[PDB]
Design a protein around this nucleic acid. Structure first.
Ligand SMILES: [K+]
Ligand SMILES: [Mg+2]
Ligand SMILES: [Mg+2]
Ligand SMILES: [Mg+2]
Ligand SMILES: [Mg+2]
Ligand SMILES: [Mg+2]
Ligand SMILES: [Mg+2]
Ligand SMILES: [Mg+2]
Ligand SMILES: [Mg+2]
Ligand SMILES: [Mg+2]
Ligand SMILES: [Mg+2]
Ligand SMILES: [Mg+2]
Ligand SMILES: [Mg+2]
Ligand SMILES: [Mg+2]
Ligand SMILES: [Mg+2]
Ligand SMILES: [Mg+2]
Ligand SMILES: [Mg+2]
Ligand SMILES: [Mg+2]
Ligand SMILES: [Mg+2]
Ligand SMILES: [Mg+2]
Ligand SMILES: [Mg+2]
Ligand SMILES: [Mg+2]
Lengths: 185, 155, 51, 222, 148, 53
RNA sequence: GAAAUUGUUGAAAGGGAAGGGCAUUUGAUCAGA
RNA sequence: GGAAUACUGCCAGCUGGGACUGAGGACUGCGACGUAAGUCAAGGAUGCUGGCAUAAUGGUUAUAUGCCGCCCGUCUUGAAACACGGACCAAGGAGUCUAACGUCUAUGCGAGUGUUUGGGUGUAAAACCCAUACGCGUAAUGAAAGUGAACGUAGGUUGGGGCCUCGCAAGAGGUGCACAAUCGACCGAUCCUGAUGUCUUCGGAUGGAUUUGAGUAAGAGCAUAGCUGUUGGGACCCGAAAG
RNA sequence: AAAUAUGUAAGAAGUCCUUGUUACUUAAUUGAACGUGGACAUUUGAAUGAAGAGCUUUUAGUGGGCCAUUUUUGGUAAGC
């Protein structure tokens, strides 16, 4: 017998391959597994880990987010890497010329980048251009902007978006939500 | 299709054995086995017979002789672990045993073997006859009697 | 592939600890100590034998 | 271009230089041990001759072996055993003696047999059952290159350097001891010498401080 | 599908994953929202504050078409213009021939002022506008025309 | 201790190279020689039982 | 044309149940080389 | 006074007998001996020999022998129970489908998404194509009238992966997405303050607050599918006394 | 007035030096808080350990307990 100080046979708790059966995603995973194993560049390892992420862990990165990241001092000529979908954003009226590497581009996002004079490239094209992630800028979309997230941690005095089907007057607003009916929260 | 044959088959290329570090060093036989010592055969068709130890062979066997004239045990190989080395010794200076070896014993009786048996036996009788009762001792078969304790007995 | 124990397997014992050869050659495990003749004090002896 | 001979010859030369360093270090360690032992013996003799008593320095090192199973252990002694890495019966570790560790030994006394290990005991333990914790793995200390690659930054180049750092509680004793995987000893080969293990050694049992007899126990357990 | 459910995996296990001590009974705590004030009060106060009681005044025969008023922020203000003409109107930012944006025809009732627009005149036709939306439209050299 | 450690570190980097700014637990006592001069050992024995009540 | 259950034949065992586990003896039978 | 011996301990002292194991499968390594060739007990067994070549080993089976072995299922703190169901066998036999949903995951598109109410079409319940709407999302807040999200490079501070520069390296500096804490700003509600103006009772600029909102602060959702979980349904299957 | 048990601390989110903001506070640049700048890495300030740490979501079963040492209540006591 052994007095175990930790749980035995505990899985790492992190994905080691995508849950997806996309053959092209599996090929990209293979390429970046090779790169992460035989380059020692942290960019390749983080891209390989990002390729495993689920959909809610790969929020879309808008072109406006890419432009704001490129407005960083010294990042104007860096290749923007988004392991996920790049979406369009009509709220920004001036997009700069740049190279964006992403898993997927929305038609509008690709059109905006091309019209601004840049290129939309795949992750294997990015690997060929910069095998060690030279001059790269990894961008991640807002994870906690999800609709599901605001209901997380619901409870007294949390302010955490009760799970409700219809909203308005008569829908969970009287007893426990205001001092005039019993108490507020 | 009855089994939907597997995608991959094991290769039928037998890999070579890696180099073994086991040299065949000469056997270190116990100090009681000295040529001329009288041994008791513990197994075989001549089990219990007392024979005379002779040249140590290259296959780790002991060349022994009855002598054949004394008890009917010819020149033959014997395993060192299947004999008891007694404390009775005849001199083997004068017995020429360089001829006998593994190839000599490699597999009605050959006249050559009869002749070498006679040649060795002549010297063996000559040496034995200067010790009283030694011929009778070698003619008599060893056996355990009631009360014999081999862990206490001396040979 | 197989752990070979020192304190046996003189080959492994010499692979580790190259000083083992000098130790064995000089018999440092059975070194004679220089003789001395200091005697315990009378007070020590009296205290030891005191009832 | 060959890039084979001019590399294997350089590796053999570096190995020979490392072995020369290890040889001189081991000779110095042997001289140090001999000098310290004869100095203690002579100090005792001189104090007796002068009519004084030489009080030996308190032991700086203990070897602790867990002699109790893993069932029915109270939480505080169980935690102390885990922090001393005795998570299995007949597992043993070296502990540098301070007040902080003496109180731990006091807490876990009914479940361990501990004492002061000799040079022979430490050498045999490290030689036969010496394993290093390398990348969270238990790797046997079958070559000095392993010890150099894992403890070289502390000046420990060989298994005898490790043994010296253990016996003489050095600046890097903590790192060397933690590098040493907890020794997995067998049951004693001649038995425990007592009918019942789980009373104190002073009371005819097996647990508690058995100061110098830990060497005989560990040797029979090794 | 059924072959992937845990009930195939519970075959041969007597309690079907529902426990030996507490079984799968019919309605141990009542049906539906029973006891929301008595024995489910904790789960009603937590995760559903405000559920019980009344909170405002009634409105008999309320028609949502009266309150139909989709809001469009200033931050887009330009997707209502066709994509091709957008570049042609962003260039030549003249007070004359300013692009006309019928927000009601686009399907909005109120224009709000969340984002910021480029400094180019636009003629915005809206049923309602926010004060800051009108301020930003005017600061961009445009104007707001009230329609119905 | 913080102020004393700062002062000790400054005086160390002014005088030589030695700091030892970490506290240490009580260490085992070193060897010492105990004399009997005026201190000859007195032999004690366990006392017999009595009540004295 | 199953099983429960039954007859006959054949084999085997059987001092107040039978059945089973590890191991081997014995009898019968049999694969692989 | 000189030893010896006991006891305890040490030796990288020598050596005999016994048992179990032989994993790995070209070389690579660390060593030892040898001047060097090379050899080796040095990153796991080889060498020689004999008998058999089949029921001999072995498997299966019946029996015998040694030791062990209470009847399953269930409720239970506790079952072999003098607790309940079960004489036996065959067949049937119990978490299903649906409406609406939570989380997670996969897929398509993405500030949009959903062709399938319907229309066109068809090799005719299929497949293929489609307009206007509609639903959900892109704005919230207030009981409501109503109002409605940039002072700022969409902020400051701290940590932050990655990236950039220098450095052999250690490290130093710069930029820092997501995310975490905090201080701010903005939108709605509440409480205040109350400018020009004026249908003199309207209007509500500006500046605030230990108040409050399921908000803004370069959008993430929509649709399909799956496990799991929820509610209503006969609702895992069988069961009342009753009405 | 113990023993056992128990709160806190053992540093870079630290210490030290100079001086910027405020509608707070002071008689007063007085103090308070938050700061700019500058200095200090071998032991960055006890020991031991660390199949790492931190974080989130969603769900099952459970919500009859019982026994042993020790402390202990009612009871003569109890397999209470
Ligand atoms: K239940
Ligand atoms: Mg185990
Ligand atoms: Mg192994
Ligand atoms: Mg024994
Ligand atoms: Mg015992
Ligand atoms: Mg189960
Ligand atoms: Mg049940
Ligand atoms: Mg028929
Ligand atoms: Mg039948
Ligand atoms: Mg009878
Ligand atoms: Mg002895
Ligand atoms: Mg057999
Ligand atoms: Mg029994
Ligand atoms: Mg009961
Ligand atoms: Mg039962
Ligand atoms: Mg009973
Ligand atoms: Mg019942
Ligand atoms: Mg019955
Ligand atoms: Mg059936
Ligand atoms: Mg019924
Ligand atoms: Mg009724
Ligand atoms: Mg219950």
């Amino acid at each position: 017998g052994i007095d175990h100080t930790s749980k035995q046979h505990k899985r790492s708790g992190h994905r080691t391959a995508p849950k997806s059966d996309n053959v092209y995603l599996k090929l990209l995973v293979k390429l970046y597994t090779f790169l992460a194993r035989r380059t020692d560049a942290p960019f390749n390892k983080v891209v390989l880990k990002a390729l495993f992420l689920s959909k809610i862990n790969r929020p879309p990165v808008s072109v406006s987010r890419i432009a704001r990241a490129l407005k960083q001092e010294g990042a104007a000529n860096k290749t923007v890497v988004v392991v996920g979908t790049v979406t369009d954003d009509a709220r920004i009226f001036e997009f700069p010329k740049t190279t964006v590497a992403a898993l997927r581009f929305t038609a509008g996002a690709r059109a905006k980048i091309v019209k601004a004079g840049g290129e939309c490239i795949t992750l294997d094209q990015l690997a060929v251009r910069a095998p060690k992630g030279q001059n790269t800028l990894i961008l991640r979309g807002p994870r906690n902007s999800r609709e599901a997230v605001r209901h997380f941690g619901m409870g007294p005095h949390k302010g955490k978006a009760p799970r409700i089907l219809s909203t308005g007057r008569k829908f969970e607003r009287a007893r426990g939500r205001r001092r005039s009916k019993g108490f507020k929260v | 299709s009855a089994q939907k044959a597997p995608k991959w088959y094991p290769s039928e290329d037998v890999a070579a054995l890696k180099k073994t570090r086991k040299a065949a060093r000469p056997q270190k036989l116990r100090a009681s086995l000295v040529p001329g010592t009288v041994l008791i055969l513990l197994a075989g068709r001549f089990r219990g017979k007392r024979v005379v130890y002779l040249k140590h062979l290259e296959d780790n066997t002991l060349l022994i002789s009855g002598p054949f004239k004394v008890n009917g045990v010819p020149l033959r190989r014997v395993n060192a672990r299947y004999v008891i080395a007694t404390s009775t010794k005849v001199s083997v200076e004068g017995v020429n045993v360089e001829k006998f070896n593994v190839e000599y014993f490699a597999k009605e009786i050959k006249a050559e073997r009869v002749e070498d048996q006679k040649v060795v036996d002549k010297a063996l009788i000559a040496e034995i006859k200067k010790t009283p009762l030694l011929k009778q001792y070698l003619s008599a078969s060893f056996s355990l009697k009631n009360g014999d304790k081999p862990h206490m007995l001396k040979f | 592939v197989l752990k070979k124990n020192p304190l046996k397997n003189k080959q492994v014992l010499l692979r580790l600890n190259p000083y083992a050869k000098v130790f064995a050659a000089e018999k440092l495990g059975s070194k004679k100590a220089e003789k001395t003749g200091t005697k315990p004090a009378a007070v020590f002896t009296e205290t030891l034998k005191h009832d | 271009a060959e890039q084979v001979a001019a590399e294997r010859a350089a590796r053999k030369a570096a190995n020979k230089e490392k072995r020369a360093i290890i040889l001189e270090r081991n000779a110095a360690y042997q001289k140090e041990y001999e000098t310290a032992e004869r100095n203690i013996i002579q100090a005792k003799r001189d104090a007796k001759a002068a009519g004084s008593y030489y009080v030996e320095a308190q032991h700086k090192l203990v070897f602790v072996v867990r002699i109790k199973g893993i069932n029915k252990i109270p939480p505080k002694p169980r935690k102390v055993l885990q922090l001393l890495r005795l998570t299995r019966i007949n597992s043993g570790t070296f502990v540098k003696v301070t007040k902080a560790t003496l109180e731990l030994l006091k807490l876990i006394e009914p479940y361990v047999a501990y004492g002061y290990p000799s040079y022979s005991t430490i050498r045999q333990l490290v030689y036969k059952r010496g394993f290093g914790k390398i990348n969270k793995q238990r790797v046997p200390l079958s070559d000095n290159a392993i010890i150099e690659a894992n403890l070289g930054k502390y000046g420990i180049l060989s298994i005898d350097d490790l043994i010296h750092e253990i016996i003489t509680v050095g600046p890097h004793f903590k790192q060397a001891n933690n590098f040493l995987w907890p020794f997995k000893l067998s049951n004693p080969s001649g038995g425990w010498g007592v009918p019942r293990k789980f009373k104190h050694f002073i009371q005819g049992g097996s647990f508690g401080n058995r100061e110098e007899f830990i060497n005989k126990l560990v040797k029979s357990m090794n | 599908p059924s072959r992937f459910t845990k009930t195939r995996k519970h075959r041969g296990h007597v309690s079907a994953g529902k426990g030996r001590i507490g079984k799968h009974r019919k309605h141990p705590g009542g049906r539906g929202m029973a006891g929301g004030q008595h024995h489910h009060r904790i789960n009603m106060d937590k995760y559903h504050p405000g559920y019980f009681g009344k909170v405002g005044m009634r409105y008999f025969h309320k028609q949502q078409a009266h309150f139909w008023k989709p809001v469009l922020n200033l931050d887009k203000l330009w997707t209502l213009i066709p994509e091709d003409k957008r570049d042609q109107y962003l260039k030549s930012a003249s007070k004359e021939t300013a692009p006309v944006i019928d927000t009601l025809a686009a399907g909005y009732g109120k224009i709000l002022g969340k984002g910021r627009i480029p400094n180019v005149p636009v003629i915005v036709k809206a049923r309602f506008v926010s004060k800051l939306a009108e301020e930003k439209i005017r600061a961009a050299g445009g104007v707001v025309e009230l329609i119905a | 201790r913080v102020k004393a450690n700062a002062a000790k570190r400054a005086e160390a980097k002014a005088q030589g190279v030695a700091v030892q700014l970490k506290r240490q637990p009580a260490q085992p006592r070193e060897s010492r020689i105990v004399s009997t001069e005026g201190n000859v050992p007195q032999t004690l024995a366990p006392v017999p039982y009595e009540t004295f009540i």
